[PDB]
Every structure is written in structure tokens, then in C-alpha cells.
Amino acid sequence: FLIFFLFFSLLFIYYLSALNNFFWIILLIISIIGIFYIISIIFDINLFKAFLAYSTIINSISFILLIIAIIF
Amino acid sequence: HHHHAGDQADRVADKIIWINIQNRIGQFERISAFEGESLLEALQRNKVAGIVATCEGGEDINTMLEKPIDPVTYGPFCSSCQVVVSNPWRNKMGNLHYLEERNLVRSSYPTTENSRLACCILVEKWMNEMIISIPQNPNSVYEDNM
Amino acid sequence: LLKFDPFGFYSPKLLSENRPEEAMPFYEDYPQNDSHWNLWEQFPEDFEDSNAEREAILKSNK
Amino acid sequence: LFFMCYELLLIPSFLIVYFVSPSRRAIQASLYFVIWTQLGSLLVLIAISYIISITNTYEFNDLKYFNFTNSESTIIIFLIFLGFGFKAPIWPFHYWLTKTHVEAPSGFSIYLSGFLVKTALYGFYKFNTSIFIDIDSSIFIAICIMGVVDSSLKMWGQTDLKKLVAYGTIQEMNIIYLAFCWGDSCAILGGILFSATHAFLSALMFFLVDCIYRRYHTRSLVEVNGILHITPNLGLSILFMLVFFSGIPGTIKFISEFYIFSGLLEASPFICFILMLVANVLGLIGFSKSWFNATFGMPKKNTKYLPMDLSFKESYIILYCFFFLFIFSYFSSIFF
Amino acid sequence: VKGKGSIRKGIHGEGFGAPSHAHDALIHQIKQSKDTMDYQNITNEVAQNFANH
Amino acid sequence: KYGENISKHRSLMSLYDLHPQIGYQSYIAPNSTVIGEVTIGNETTVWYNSVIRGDVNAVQIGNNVSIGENVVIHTAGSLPTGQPASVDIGHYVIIGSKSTIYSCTIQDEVVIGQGCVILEGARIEKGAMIAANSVVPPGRLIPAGTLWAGNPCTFVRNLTKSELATNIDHAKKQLHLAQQHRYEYLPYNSAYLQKSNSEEDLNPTKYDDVTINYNFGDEERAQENPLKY
Amino acid sequence: FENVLLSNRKNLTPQESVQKVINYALLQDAKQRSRTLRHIKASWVIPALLFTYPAWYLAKGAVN
Amino acid sequence: MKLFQAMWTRTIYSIGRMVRETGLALDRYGCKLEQDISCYEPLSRHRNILPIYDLVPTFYHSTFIAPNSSLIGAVYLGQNTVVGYGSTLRGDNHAIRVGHNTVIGDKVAISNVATLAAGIPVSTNIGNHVNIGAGCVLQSCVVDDNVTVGHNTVILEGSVLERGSVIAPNSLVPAGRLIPSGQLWAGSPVRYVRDLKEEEIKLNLEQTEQNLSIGKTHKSSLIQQEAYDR
Amino acid sequence: MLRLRLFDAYEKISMTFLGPLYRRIGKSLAQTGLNIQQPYTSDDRLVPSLRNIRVTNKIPSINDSEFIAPNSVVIGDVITKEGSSIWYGATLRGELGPIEIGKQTVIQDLVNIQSGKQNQKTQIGDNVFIGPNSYIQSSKINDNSFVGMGSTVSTGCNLASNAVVAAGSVVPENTQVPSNQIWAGSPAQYLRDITPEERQVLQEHHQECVQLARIHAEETEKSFREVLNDFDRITAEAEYDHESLALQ
Amino acid sequence: MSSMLIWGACFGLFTRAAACKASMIPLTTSPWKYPKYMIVSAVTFYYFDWY
Amino acid sequence: YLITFNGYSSTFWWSHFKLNNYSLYMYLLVIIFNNYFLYITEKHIKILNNYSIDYFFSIINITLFIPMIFLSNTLFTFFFLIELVSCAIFYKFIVSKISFKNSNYKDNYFSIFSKNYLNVLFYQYWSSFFSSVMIGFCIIYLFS
Amino acid sequence: GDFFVDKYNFSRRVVDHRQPYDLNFSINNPVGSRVWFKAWKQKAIGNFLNLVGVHYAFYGAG
Amino acid sequence: YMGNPAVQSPPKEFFNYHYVPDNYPDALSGFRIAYRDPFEVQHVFAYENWEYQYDGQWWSMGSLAC
Amino acid sequence: SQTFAHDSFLGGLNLFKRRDPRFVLDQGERPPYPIINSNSSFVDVLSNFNKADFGLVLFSAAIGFPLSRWVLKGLTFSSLNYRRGLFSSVYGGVILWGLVLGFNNSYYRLNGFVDNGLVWKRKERKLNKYDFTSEFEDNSFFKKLRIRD
Amino acid sequence: RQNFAKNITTTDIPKDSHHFAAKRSGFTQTEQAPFAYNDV
Amino acid sequence: LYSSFKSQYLLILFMTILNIFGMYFYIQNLRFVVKKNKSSILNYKNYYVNINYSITLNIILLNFFNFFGILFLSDLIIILNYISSYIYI
């Protein structure tokens, strides 16, 4: 979260901002696909570690959507 | 009970429910259980082997042990209380619930046609001298071996 | 219902409020009005609460 | 600040529900109530964030000093209505309210029905007046009318006293929310009066239900009947509560009903007549038949465990509620 | 018994497992006959291993 | 041999690494003795002059357990029915003072009279009420929620819901007394400084290697129990 | 202050002696309860007088 | 004024507790610094006299108490009374008052009920010249004057025992019941057996006097053997 | 290495100076705290060992006892034979009469052995088992006798060899217990003739009790150093891996 | 109030009280932790405000 | 050392390192978070010693190089640092204890086959291989 | 002896039973001492014997 | 859907009231409560548990036009 | 704000005072003091060491004893020789950190990043438009750390 | 349950001591113990 | 608020849906919170349960900064804005 996620966000915001016109479509498609595919899976966990991982994944997807908004 | 005044207490031996079980070492062991107790509870009290019992009976509220099973019940939480019942005992038990079947289907180890959850099994007077087998249930997480 | 008497107005009500059983605890009987919104234990004003017997024993042992 | 304060009440309600309710089924009820309240809060928060971002100011005067576009005003109005109706409650987002009133503790349900709905209505009214909208309020009016009709129609099938009281409260809330649909017109006074009357009536009904569940240890009519024969004061109080809930002319419910019906008939006469036909008769008949069957009879069941009469605390509470409902009509008309 | 974990000491011998545990037939056979194999005895476990193979 | 001045009686005594386990908020009287594999629940109150010998078999004591004074509890190692011969107590059991327990089962919400004896194999179910000065015949099952008395005990009458609620409330009553008693003792024992230096204390006969100290890292652990050894 | 329990009541009937002992015990229990309540109220008054000012200062600094 | 005095007493107790805790912690830290093992001595923390905050026990010096006895909380013991070895007197709930020259057997547990109805006190009141057998279990009782209690006798809450009464060993005075004067009670369900006799009463009084003398002799032996405090 | 020299010097100074000064300061502070909290508090006392109380001329002879509890009370003229066991919390007051405990004689926990008379000889035979929480009053119990937990042996009871008094039973005064006879109930009456299986079970229980007493005495007779070492061993076992156990 | 040092001292006292209470141990234990935590919290708060 | 740092923003070591105020602030924040987490982890370790020296060494080594990623100025250095971090993560995963002290006495003559550690290792290794191949292909294409 | 203060002897002290295994070893002496020099020589001889090429490639190259 | 006029035996497996864990008893009016009628309990806990059997059967249930 | 005299035993305190919280300056910004040698080599930096670096090393060595003691407090079941070796290694690491800090301070002084007894001919005039800390630091110890407020 | 003090001290409870009388003589060999408190 | 300031209605709707799903998933765990009695999940040291006072203090500080930390959001927001100010500068 602190290193990899922030590095990816900065790469999509500060490093490769000149190509943000192309990253927007891919990011939006990935976010939509994740929102559509993970919602069904998020309601069938039966392990505490799996629940923690699912919370982390949901937070990552939300942060990805936030970064997509920020790139505008 | 309907116990009257002055009557002596009843010996627990008259209420002993016998379960002959095939343990993973292929061993025929006889366990004694009390009426109303879950199969998982009886196994834990008798220190039976082969049952991982990851969920430790699952949820404590609206549990599958309540009769009738509530529609808002969450069902089993693991796939470790797998016990294969005998033909008469399984026939008397009936058909597994929707959640029971859904959970038993998603099991790493192969299951049998008479496989039921020990935590979902309730002690009934009809289960005297009941035959059960306990194939080695799977181990799921890093804390399962702790 | 004919024999019922909650406040003991029509029939005498013992201070013990029960006849203790030979094998049951002599716990307090449940009041008809279970209002738990009761104020602090009120003692009469200017009440001597000093341990008189303990003070006498202290004087004796000293 | 208004939005933050409106959002804080959810945590105390969830804490009370999770730790004070005696019912075992109340866990799922609390979860559903929390979920619905959070959905309404999310809708309201989206609307508030849109409003704040549109005009970077935090004053209603500054909001009035700005004009929103057509799409912006439509979206803001729709989102505010959706959030407030999920918190009203409104059909078909009333399952949470139904389950809560079915399972929650008596004190919490009395407070939850009495206060939270009024707070949500007040927030919706405050936000709606501060925003000028050129759209047609037909959607909101129809939603309120349909919710009132649905709540009133289900009364005849409710054997649980708490469930019937919840249905009546839902109908009253829908009727109240119907009033403020005319914008900043002269409809707020009727809505406020109806909200006060509904709060008092719901408080009385919840207190009666709590007293019954404490005395007869039940909430369904099938196991408790003939209350007046063993509990005369309780039966008289129930009869008086039914009379008050009938919108009797002396009660403030009559004045609020008159104002609301006058406004509706001025807008839609046939719709006003239909609304008067359903709630005042059908739902009222159902509530009375459910209440009357328990009011009278002969409680032959459980002779050795019969309950006692109402305590002086409950009697004083009922007297205070009746006094508020009656004397509240004598307030100065400068505000009404 | 010191250093034997939950295993305790009886009157006519010492246990090989926890209290109220399952006495494994293979463990007893190994302990009694150190290396004696009178025959390849066909036990339930042996049959299960053969069936698995 | 047995000649000494300062008694060495230790309430918590392990036997061949069979260390007892103690839960939270528990009040173990310093005059009591606990030897053997005994797992006590959270907030359990053990009175003084009581002995719990978990040697023959382990003993599980519930959370809201209230053990009276002069109570002797011990296991048998084996039961006639072959069932687990260990003492097991439910969640909230109020055992009367000067009682005898010999590898018997007590379910939750149990009330035991003072001077009562529960022999081997006996099982008191939930809600059970056993009167004072009674003897439970070995290998007998007390009906759930039943008030029974006698020597041997006989079923007297079924307990009411009000009686069960009153008993449950009485179980919760000892919490304040236990908290006060725990607050009475200091976190650090003061008996050590009261003695005089000895030859062995000044001159160690043999030296041992330095390992993880018995109180290693104890700085970061809160001293919840003042009676900690 | 005379402890009737620690008094020579051997000159009366057993029932009367028991009643007098009960009265003395009631008076002593009332005194003990009153003293205990007087001490217990201090468990609230001292903490109320102690942390009120600090709590007010901290909350005010946090808010305004 | 009383509230201020109680607050001052509580503040003094808290300050003393803080000072004692700081001193003990400093001593343990120093023992750790000097590589000493005296601070971790597994000495028992039991105390024969437990002052429960304000509930300070009070007993005249004429009384004999075995070191194993456990008197906790508000207790008020008369002069020359003898307490058996390991006997417990729990005064945490209510006061426990005892008359002078009374003998309590070893492992005798006297306590109080949490609450009761009006007319029956929650304080354990015991008269003078009484004898209580070993294993006795007294709860919230009022026993008057020279009573005789056999071995392992249990008096329940609300019991009122009159003067000159005899209860044989292994008996139980029921809850809220009255033991008649000059009569012998038998059975766990206490039933009147026979009226007390002059010879029996004299023998009981002599036995109580002998128990007091034996307690005095035991105290004398313990004082010499340094097994008795003060 | 100047680093190692400085470390040694600092450790020496810190120990040899702070230990005394800080220890004295802490002792003074503890004394002040104990003084301030008075009188509404209590302090730790040196608990006397009631296991060897000698009255005038009566001195216990319990050196041959295999198990003597740390918290038990042994006061007066009581002589025990080899293999004798007295469990925790028992009270044997020999002031009220001489006590003759036989060999392999087990007196369980919280047992009150007190003579009803001021001078009477209470004589227990060899291999005599007594149950916990019992009350014995100056009796003559022969060899191989069994008394259950919570039993009440009256003043005049005379038990023959291999006689069983069931747990919770109260023998009346002046009762003669026959051999191979088992009695039970609050009014003790001869219940049944003991079968060989029951006698074997009782003997096995007695032997197990003797062995447990031996183990406990091996445990109960530990010194301060032994107790500290055991605690340290438990702590190390709490952090010793499976490889550590294999290496051990 | 207004002083960052006073606010930090109050915060430290409250934190010590809360930590002691949540530990289930009785209050007035380790009194040296009270002034130390108060000073530490006051310093931390003043430094945070200046930063 | 970072607190006392001063200078001008430029490229370091043949333009392979980026030394900017934002990068320094990010490194400082990462270090502070790592220090707080390490304090918490040490406090937890003092409770029960369920972790070995190797896991702590792997964590320390990961923490040694983790802050350097913020100073990357080129995709080659970023790829190398990310590969190093992935290797450190795999090493830390290998440092997990396979067996634990449990009171499960019934399993003393039977074998329990747990595949959690092997599955974790296989998944991590395959994902790391695929990601490294993709990143290398991306760098090679971007350079051209 | 024992500086008995009230009830606590201010001179009570128990020598620790736990100490270093190599507490009195020759190598444990201060660096540069004759015993330390001999112990260091023995340790260096052992290290050179066990790892000869390693020691050469490390120190000689350094 | 309608009730069966025929006599039926007392219910055996029907939804029954369950108390929350550690529920403090409400001892109003002396805590004098009796055993409830099984049929009454089943009827009380009937609507909250009733559900449709087949998908789409909700439409034709009762009166289609209504 | 005044600066501790350069080449003294307290020159490291100047590294604890900064005008702004900026970690680095701009590419075109003039240094606070004159620059002696921007093109500094390792040998030049070594030659630039002085009493400030010596005092920094001494302070690191002194403070290193408490840190080493704290580190050693967490070691259990270890030999005295092992504990002494670990403590010596920790102290050596602390001394190395102090030497590195001294070298960095010398490099900054040669580059003019910190005070080195030099003042530019024409001072850079900066107007503090946003000044919410002048009063705050003016009545506390925060002024002693802010160079020129 | 109720935890208040029943034996109040602010006033005296008016009690009729003649309503119930405790038996004190001629008890049967199996008779039950009389009630200690009989004030109404 | 940032998404609205950036005029992303579709992003706002998707974030709201995701937040609702996450709230439901997280609250689903609160159903299993209830237990029939007090549990025992604390490790035992020296025969008694050991509670880490330092961990308790850290948890108390975190709970304080979470329950009432919303009011103190100004300083954190200012610090983050200052950090991000030099990102492009």
C-alpha cells in the first residue's frame, strides 16, 4: 500500500502523465470489470485472512477509481 | 423428564448414545454422546481424530442445529466437520439444506454421498448405535496447523 | 386471581414477603413494580454512621 | 455542519440496536437498518458534495446568491429526495423501518420513529428551500401517495401490534413528506404540525406496545385478548389512543389533516379524496380491528400468571402524551 | 509423568497418548514387537493403503 | 525435614510442566491451592481454603465461576462409563462452600448447595439446583433446571424462570466483591523484603546459565492481577 | 454507644433478647451503610473535581 | 464536612498506594540492575487480617486467632474468643459481629448474604459463650448466647438461633427459620428432637470453657514459637 | 577495544552504584507508602508454617511422612509412619489427643482430624485411605480401611480392616464397622458386601493416591532457586521451537 | 484551552487514564507513567503545531 | 540524517537517481510508517516468540531498500529496485514457520499434508516472473 | 548483615543463580590483556585452520 | 392459500422465540410467565418466515387482477 | 536568528536549524552563504573536516551508549562474549553514523548549505507575505530552531 | 434483580406483630422448623 | 468531494456503488460478533493471561484518533497539501 500503490499512482500521475490520454480508457475498463466481477465474490468469504485481503482489494479498486478521477 | 417428588436420579448410562466411528487410522472407535449435543461437540468432548473443525461449529446465532432451520441462517463456515453416515442414519437424517449442499460441494478433499457436517448434525434418540466414518478433512490456512 | 394481593392491602403481607423453602434460597421476592430508576440509598439527615462498636474495641485494645 | 450532524446519529442507533435489543432476530434487523441508513446517508452526502463543489461556500445566503443549472438542480433535488425518502422511510425502502420496528427495543423504536424521521424531514426541508428548482414535483408527490397507500393497505393483515403501529407510522411519515413537495409554498406549517402529531401518536402507541409486552409478555394478538377485562386502565388508554389516531376534530391531527387535505385538493382534488378514503378508513379500520380484538374479550388463558395494572409512571406518561396532543393545538397561530 | 506432555502414568503401565485418547494399534504393535513380523497382517489401514494404490 | 518458619505454600503449582492457565479478571484467594492442569475462565472467583487438584485429570472452570470456601475438587482418572473423566464446568456455576467434587460435570447456570458432594460420573445439566448438604450418587444425571435434594439426592421440584433469573443475578453479584479483594493486594508482593539474608542467598552453591528471564519483557505487560507470582 | 450483642442480656426471655439484638444489628448495619455511602460518594466527587477542568480545556482547545 | 473528610481519606489512601507502588517498582528495578534474585521470591501474599478499604477489622487483644485463619473485611470480635485454624470470616458484604468468649472450630466459614427482605438483617450476629463445630457454614445468621453447634453444621441465611440450643453434628438450620430455645435439633432438615437437659447444658458450657483454655494454650505456644503475631 | 572497555566500566559503575542507591531509595519510598496508606490497608506478612506446631510437650513426628503439605496444619502429638500422606489444607490437631497414623496412610485435603475428647488416641491402621473434606473424631480405623470424601467419622466409630465408609456418609457414635462391608448415607448403614472388583478398584485408587502424593512431595519440596529455575524452564518451553525440543 | 503545552499535558493524562482503564488493572498504578506521558504528549503537540 | 539534509534538486549518479523535495518527503513518510510498524511488531514479538531471526533480517533488509524507490529517476532503476523488493518479499515469505507448538495430541501417529506455504510460494514466484517479464518488455519497448 | 528497617531488612540480598556460561573465560578479559591475547591467538589459529583460504583471501587481500 | 379446517397435532418443529445472549430478564409483574401455545407461537412467527416457493409465483398468488 | 560559531565544538547544532522545511533548494536558488567549492571531491571533503565534525562524532559516541544499552536490553539467552561483541558492534555503528554526519556537515559547509563563517555580499530580500509562525515562535523555544524566523 | 436496601432507616415500618405466631413448643419428630420472621 | 470538483458523475456513481457493497461486506462480519459468553483469546504468561500495556496504549491512541480525529483533519490536510505542493513545483 505505502510503496507499490503510491508508486503506481505517481507513475500514472507524475511519471507518465503525458500518456494519460491513453491510460484513461484502460483504467476505466479495468475499474468497471473489477467492480462487476469482485462484487459477487466479495459476499462468499469464509476466512478472516480472506476478508482482510478482500478489504485491501476493495480499497485498492476505490483508490484506482480515485486516481482515474484525479488524472482528469 | 416428568420426574416426580422423591424419585432417585437417573444414571447417565441410560442416556448414553453410542456412535461407532471409523477413524482415519482405519480404527473402529466407540464414542458416547448426550442427547441434544452436536456431533462436533461430541467429537471434541471425546477427542476424536480426523476432524479439523476449522469453524468450531460455525456461527453461534441462528445455527443449523436449531429446528426448524431459519431462512436467515448462514450455514456452515468451513468444510472440516465432514462425516460419512451409515445408510440407515443418513436415510433418517434426510436431505441436506441448500447451504449445507453448497458448502459440502466446495471441498478440497473428495466427499461421499452420505457426507454431512458434524457441526450440523444434532443428537437424536434415533441415532443410538449410529455408524459414522471420519475421512481426513482438509487443512485450509496457516493458522490451521497452529 | 381471587387470592391475588400484590401490595398486601386486603390480606396481611409478611415482612419476609415469603415463607422460605427448606431447600431454596431466601432471595428477595420480585416486586410487582420493577422500576430500577430508584435514587441513592437515603439515610436520615444528621445520622451517626461512625463505627461505635469498633471505636469501643479500639479504646479497649489501646 | 448540518450534514455531519445528520450523519452522526447512525452510530448511536446502531450501537443501541446491537447491544440493547432483546430479540435474537434483531441482529439482521440492525444490519439491514444500518445498511439502509448508510445508503440514504451516501445519497445525501453525494448531493451535499455536489452542492458544495458547485459553489465553494458554506452559507445558505451564498447559496441563494447563486443559481444552479437545470441538470444540476434536477440531480440535486433527485438525490436529496432519494436520501430523505430512504430516511423517511418511503416505499419501497421501508423494509428496514419495518424490520427495525418489529425487532428493536421499545425505547429505541420510540426514539427511532419519533426523532430520526423528523430530523431527516427537517434536513430535506432546509435543503429544498435553499435550492430553487424548476422541475415538476410530480415524481415526489406520486411516490409519497403510493407509499401512503401501500402502508395503509397492509394494516388489515397485521396481527403484531408493533408491526401495525409501524405501518401506521410509515403512512403518517409518507403523508407528512407529501406536504413539503410544493417547494417554499405555504405547506411547511401543515408538515410540521403533522410531524408533531405523528411523533406524539407514535410515542403513545409504542408506550402501549411496551406496556403490553411487559405485562402479557407478548406482542401478537393471537395469544393476548381481553386486556380491558384484566387491565381496565390499559384498555381505556388504548381506546383513547385509537380515538386520537382517528384524527378526531379536537386533536392537532385534525388541524394538520385539514391543512394537508386543503393543499392537496387545491392541487389535486381527486388524489386528495383518494388519500383521505384509504388512510382514514381502510388503514384505520385495520388498525382498530387489530386493536379492538385485543382491547376486549375474556383473558381466560394463563390465570395463574395474569399481569397487573399499569404503574403510575406509565399512567403519568400517557396523561402527559395526551395533554401534549390536546393542548398543542392551542399554540399561537403566528407560527401556524 | 515428567517430560511426557499430557501423557500420564497408570498403575499397570504407562500410556502412549493423551488422557482419554485413542490407542493406536500400530503403535502398540511396534512397541511390543520391536521388529517381529510374524506375517504381513491385513489390517484396515493396510487395506486402505492398498485401495489407494 | 518438614521444619520451617515461613510457609512455602504457593497457590499456583505446576506438576511436570502441567501449568495451570488463568483467565482475565480472576480473583484467586491466596489461601487457596491450585495444582495441576486447570484452565480457569475469565473473571472467576475462587474462595480461600479451597483445593483444586488437577493431577489425576485436567479441570475446566468457566468464566462466571464462583467457587466457595473449603471446597475440595479432584479428578479420578477414569470413569465407569468411559466418558471423559475430567471436571468440566459451564459458563456460570455458583458452587457452595465446603463442597466436594470428584471428576463430575456441571453445566452452565448451575447452583450447588454448601457441603454438597458430586461424585464421579455425576452430571448436573443447565439450570440445575442442588441443595446444601447433599450427596449425588455416582454416575447420575440431574435433570436440567431441576431443584433436587437428599442423601442420596431426590428430585424435589422444577425451578421457575424467576428462580433461574434470580440465580443468574446472584452469580453476577460476586464481581464487585472480587474486584475489591483484588484491589486490596498490591501489584508487587512485599513479603520478600521482610526476610533476612541467608548463606545460600549470599553464596550460591551452583551457577546456572542466563536464559529468558521469568520476568523477561514484563515491563510492557499490564499488571492486571496484583496477586501474580 | 453500647453494643447490645456485647451486653449481658441473660435477664430476659430469649425472644426479647433476640429482638433487642436484631434492633441493635439494624442500627449498626444502618450506620455501616451510611458510612460506606459517604465514602463511596467521594469516589465520584474527587474525580469530578479533578478532571473536569482539564477535560474542558482539552475539548475547548480541540473545538474552538 | 463528612464528604470532605471522606474525600481527604480517599486521597490519602491513593497517595499512599502510589508511593508504595513507586517504591516497590524502584526496588524491583534495582534488584534487576544489581543482578539479584530476592525481588522475585515466590512468597505467599496471604494475610490473616484483611482490611477492606474502610472496613477495618476490630477485635480485642484477648482473642486467639490461628495464623491460618482468614478474617477479611468488617469484623467485630469480642474478647477472649477463639478462632479455629483455617476458619474464614468474610466481612466484605456486611458486618460480622461476635460476642466475647465464643469458640469457633477449625475451617468454620462465616459470611453474609448479599441482600434479603426487611426484618432479617444481612449482618452475621453471634452471641457470647457459644460453641461452633469444625466445618460449620454460617450465612447471614443471628445466633444468641451459649449455643452448641456440632461438626459440619450449616446455618442458612435468615436463621435465628435462640439461646441454650443444641444442634448435633452434620445438621442444617434452614433459611429464615427459628431454632427454639432449650431444644435439640436433628437432621439436615432441622427437626426438633428433644429438650436440652441440665447435664447436657453444663457439659456444653464446660466444653466451651475448655475450648477457650485450649485456645489460650495454643496462643501461648505460638507466641513462644514465633508463630503468633504481636 | 575502547568500546568494550567503556561497556565494562559503565556496567560495573551502573550496577555497583545504582543497585545500592536505587534499592535504598525504593525501600524508603515503599516504607513511606506503607505508612501513608495506614490504617485503611494491609501489608504482606511472613506466613508461619503451621506444619510443625508443637504444644508444650507434644511435638509432631511426621519426618517419616512421605507427603506433608506446605499449607497443612499439624499441631500437637501426632506420630505418622513411613509413606504417610497429608494433603493440602488438612488440619491434624494433636492437642486434643495422641494420633497414630499408620504406614501408607493417606489423609486427603481439607480433612479435620480432631478428637472429640480432650485426651483420646485416634489410631488409623496401615494403608488407610481418608477422603477429602472429611471430619474424623477420635476413631480407631483398622488397616486397608476406606473412607470417602466428605465423610463424618463420629467419636465412637470402630472400623474393622477393609471396611468401606462411602463418601458423604456420616457414621453415628459408637458404631462398629464390619470387614468387607460398605456403608453409605447420612445415617450410615451397612449397604453391601464389597465385591472383589470394588476392592481392587479401591486398592488401585489408594495406590494412585500414594503415587500422586509422592509426585507432589517431589514438587512441593522445591526451594526458591528450584522454583525460579522451573519458571524459567516453562518460559523457555513457551519459546522453544520444535528444532529446540529435538535438540534437547 | 489556548496553550499547546496545556492541551498536550491534558491529552497525556487522559491517554494514561484510558490505557490504565482498558488494561483492566486498577488506576494509580505506575504513577511515573502519568507525568512522563503528560510531558511527552505536550512536547509532541507543541511540535506538531509548530510544524 | 535526512532531517539535516540540504542541497539543490538535481539528478544523481549519472541521472539514475532523482533527488527532489517530494521524493525526500515520500522517503521520510515511508520511513516513519515503517518505524511505527516496527515498534508495533517488536511489541507483539515480545508477547509470543512465533517469529525467527531470519524473518526479522528479511524485514530489516526490505526496510533498508524500500525508501530508495522514491528516488528512482529512470524505469531501469525502478525495475531493478522492484525486482529487489519482490525478492525480499519472497525471502520473507520463505521465513514463515512451518510448524507450531499446539496441544493437538490426537495427531501424533498420522500425517497432515498442508500445502499453504507451497501454494503461496508458487503463486508469488509465478506472478513475480510474469510481472518482471512484462516490465522488462515495457522498458525495452519504451527505450526504442 | 541485615539493616532491618521496620519489618523489611534493607540489606536483604540474594545472589543471582543465572550468569554467563563464559563469564570467567580468558577471552572475556579486557582486550589487549595477556589472557585475552592468548585466547585471541587460539581463536585466530582455530579460524585459520577451519577456513584457511577464506582467511587468506579476506585479510591478505584487505 | 388458506388454513386447514382439519384438526392437527401440536406443532413440533416451528420457529420459536429466541433470547439474545446474556439477556437480562424482564421481571415485571413478578416474572410470572407460562408456556405459550405452540400453535400461537407458530402463527406469531409465521409471516416473518413465509416465502414464495417458485420464482414468478408471486404474480398469480391470490388474485391475479388485484 | 544567530548561528553557533563555526569550527567550534557545537557546530552540529547549525545543522539542526533551518530557514524553511524544504529538504532541498531549487536548481537556480542562491545558497544562504557563499559557496566555497561546488566541485568538491572526496579528498576535499575529508580535508574539510573540523572541530564541528569532531564534536559531532563525540556526541554520537556519547549518545551511542544509551542506544546500545537499549538494544542490548532486548537480548536473551546469549553469552556474555556475544553480548559484548554485539554491543561493541552497535557502538561502532553509532560512531560510523556520527562520522558520516560530520562528513555531510563538512560537505554542506564547503557547499554553503549551512553556516560556515561566510556571508554573501548582497543579502537576498524575501518578504514574508504569509507569516503565521513569527508570533508562535517568538514566545517559545521554536525560535531557536528557525533561522531568521 | 433488585439490589436496594429493604431495611430502610428514614422511618419505621408499621408492622403488626400479632398476625402470625411462630411455633415454639411440642414440635413433632419430623416437623418443620418454624419461621423466624413473622412480622406483617 | 474531489470527484465532484473534477466533474465525474459516472465515477461518483461507481464509487458510491462500490462503497455500498463494501459497507455491506464489512457489516456482514458484525453479525458473527455476538458470542454466548465471554471468550478467551488472550495468551497466558506466568500461568495467567498476559495483556500488552504498550499495545493497549497504541490501540487507545488509534481509537482516539479515529473516533474524534475528524475534527483534527485540518492539520493533516494542510500537511498533505504542502507535501503535494512541491510535487509539480
Ligand code: FES
Ligand atoms: S464447523 Fe465448519 S463444517 Fe462444521
